C-alpha cells in the first residue's frame, strides 16, 4: 500500500536516479544504492529542488523581456529556448549559488536530508561554480552570457539565422565592453568568460532533467513550460 | 545440425534457385538443405561462426572471405586436381589464402563497356579516341561516354590500365607495403580521366543514378557498368550492347574482378557433405542453371557452363573484361586503398588539386595501416594529439604528472578537434552510416559542428591555439603548478586573437566565434565518443590506455 503522506516523493526520485545511473556505467551496482539510501531518506530538501522550475521560468521571462528576442520569428524564439534551456538553467543556478558557501546538497567532507548528488556531477558542478566565483562574474556579465548561449545561429530550423548571428555578435561586444571596462587589469578576461561556456554542457540536458527537475511526461522541462503557457 | 547443411546467401542472388538444388540433394541423400538470406549476412556470419554456430556453407564476394580465413572462420576446402580444371584457373587465385583454398568460386563479375547500337553501332577500342568522339555525338544533342565517376571502383580500370595496381601479388599472397597507385602508368590514366572533364566531355559530378538514367533513355552513347545494370535496361529498351573496355596506351583496362564464392564453415560437422553438395551438385551445368534461372549470375567460374553462356555476347564480354582485370585483394588493407583512391579521384576531378599530388597522397593512405577501420584511424588521431602536445616546448617544462593529468582530462576535446580538422577538406571519413537511432542523431550534430568550423574557415594556427586552450585548463583538479598552466592558456588566448585580427581584420568578432566552437566539443560525452570512434578498454579511457601503453613499451 502507498503511505498517504506528503513526504514520500523522494522514494522513487532516489531509486530512479539510482537504477538509471547504475545501468549506465558511471556507477557500479553497490555505488548507487548508498546514494539512493541517503537520498530517499533525504526528504528534507527535495521539494524545493524540483521547485527549481522558477529558475527555468525566470530564464524564459528574461528572454521574453528582451525586445530583440521578441522581434525574432515566433518559431525561432521557441527553437532557441528549447535548444538552450539546460545552459540557461545552469547559468541561473550558478548565479543563484554564487554568493553561497554551503548548499542544499553537500557531499564530501564530514549530508542529512539533502539530495546526495552523484560523484562526477558534484565534482564538476562544484568546480564549475568555483570558476565563476573566482572571477568577478557580475550581473551584466551573466546577462551577456545568457544571451550568448541563447542566440545560437547554427541551431537548425531557424527561419532567420543571420539575425540570430547579429544578436550574438552584439552580445560579445556587450560582454567585452563591460569586461574590459570594469577590469582593465585583466587583459584576457573576455576569453576566460567565454571559456566558461563549455562547462554548461559537461552535464547533458537529459541528466539536468533527471537530477534537478520533477517528472515530465516524455517532454523536456522547457517544452512543458511553453506548452502550459499556451493552454491558457 | 550435424546430419544436414544450412546455407547463407544474400537476397540479390538466386536464393530460390539454390533451394531447388538443395531439395534434389535432400531427395537423393536424405540431407535436409535449408537456404536462408539473412540481412546483415556478411556481418552476422563473423558472429555466429566466430564462436560455434551459423551455416555450414556461406556465399559471398571473395574479398570478404579474407577476414574470415584470418579468423579461422573458414574451413580449408580440398578439391581434386580433376575438379580444379573444371573452373577457370584464375578464379582459384580469388579464393586462395596463405596458399590454401578456402572457398569454391562460382560466378565472376566485372565492369564492361555498355553502348547504344542505335547511336553508336561501333564503340571505340581505345580511350584516346573518346574525346574527339564526344564532339561528333554532341552535335546531334547527345553524349559519348557517361559513368559513375564517384566511386574508385568505377574509375580504376583506366587508372590501372598502364601499370596501376592496388597491392602487389607476389608469392601466393599480397604485400600491404607495396602499393602501385602513384606509378608511371598511374598518373597516366588519372590525368587522362581529369582531361575528359577538363574538356567538358564528362562531368566530375556524375554519379551512378545519373549515368544509369542518362544512358537508359538515350542521352548517352556509352557507359561503364556491371551485369546488375543489364536487366534494369530491359524495363526501358534502348538497343544496347556489352563489349570490352577501351584500351589505354595500348594496354587493356584493368577492372576489379569480383568472385561470388562459397566457403565452408570451419566449425561445420558437415565439411564432407557441404563439399559433396558443392562439387557434385551446385558447380554443374544443371546445378548452376537452376540458380541462374531465378536470378542471372552473369559469367560463371565453371568452364562447362560458362561456354554455354558465352553464346550471350553480353556475358562473354564480362568474362573477357574480368580476365584482363585484377582480382580484388581479399586483405583487410583494401579499406585504406578504397579511401585513398576515393579522395585522389574526386580531388583531381574537382580541381581541388592536381593529378600527381592526389596520387602521392593516395600513395601513403593505402600503405597507411590506420585507415582500415574507424577504430584504428581514431587511435591515430589521438596519438597525434599527444605527439602534438609533447612537441610543444612549454609542455615538457611542466610537472610530469601535470602533463598526464592534462592529456587524460581533455582527450575527448583534443581528439574531436583532431578529427574535425582532419575532415575539413574531405567530405567523408569516420562517421557516415546510411547508404533515427542515437548513433544517428549524434552524427548529425557532429557533422553540424564540422560545418561550423568550415564556414569560419579555421586555419592550422587556429586549430593549434584551440588545442592549447583545450589542453591547458588550470582548473583541472590535481595539478601541481596550476599557475603555469593559467599562463600558457592565457598566452594561447593572446596568440589566437593576435592571429585572428591579423588574418581577418574585417571580422572584429572572429576571436569570440572561434572560442564559441569549443562547447560543441563537449556536446557528445567522452563516454559516448569512446563507444563510437574507439575500441575495447573496460573501465578505461583511450588516452589512459594510450598513455599506459607508452609506459609499458
Residue numbers in the entry:
A (entry chain B): 331 to 372, 1215 to 1282, 1289 to 1410
B (entry chain A): 5 to 372, 1215 to 1281, 1293 to 1410
Task: Give sentences copied directly from the paper behind this entry.
NR2E3 is an orphan nuclear receptor that is highly expressed in photoreceptor cells and plays pivotal roles in photoreceptor development, differentiation, and survival. In concert with other transcription factors, NR2E3 has a dual role to consolidate the rod fate of rod precursor cells: NR2E3 is associated with the promoters of both cone-specific genes, including the cone opsin genes, to repress their transcription, and rod-specific genes, including rhodopsin, to activate their transcription. In this study, we solved the crystal structure of an apo-NR2E3 LBD, which reveals an auto-repressed dimeric conformation that is required for NR2E3 repressor functions.
We thus designed an expression construct of NR2E3(217-410), which lacks the N-terminal region that corresponds to the flexible loop in TR4, as a fusion protein with a non-cleavable N-terminal MBP tag and a C-terminal non-cleavable His6 tag. Each monomer consists of a canonical antiparallel three-layer α-helical sandwich fold comprising 8 alpha helices (H3-5, H7-H10, and AF2), with a disordered region between helix 5 and helix 7. The dimer interface is a parallel coiled-coil formed by the helices 10 of both monomers. Instead, the C-terminal part of helix 10 bends and collapses into the space that corresponds to the ligand binding pocket in other NR. This space is filled with hydrophobic and aromatic residues (W257, F261, I381, I386, F390 and F391) whose bulky side chains protrude into the cavity and, in this conformation, do not provide enough space to allow ligand binding. The kink in helix 10 and the subsequent collapse of the binding pocket of NR2E3 allows the AF2 helix, which follows helix 10, to bind in the cofactor binding site of the LBD. Hydrophobic interactions stabilize the AF2 binding in this position, with residues M400, L403, L404 and M407 in the AF2 helix forming Van-der-Waals interactions with residues from helix 3 and 4. As a result of the occupation of the cofactor-binding site, the AF2 helix would block the binding of either a coactivator or a co-repressor to the LBD and would therefore be expected to inhibit the receptor’s activity. Single mutations of L372 and L375 to arginine reduced NR2E3 repression ability by >50%, and the double mutant L372R/L375R retained only 20-30% of the activity of the wild-type receptor.
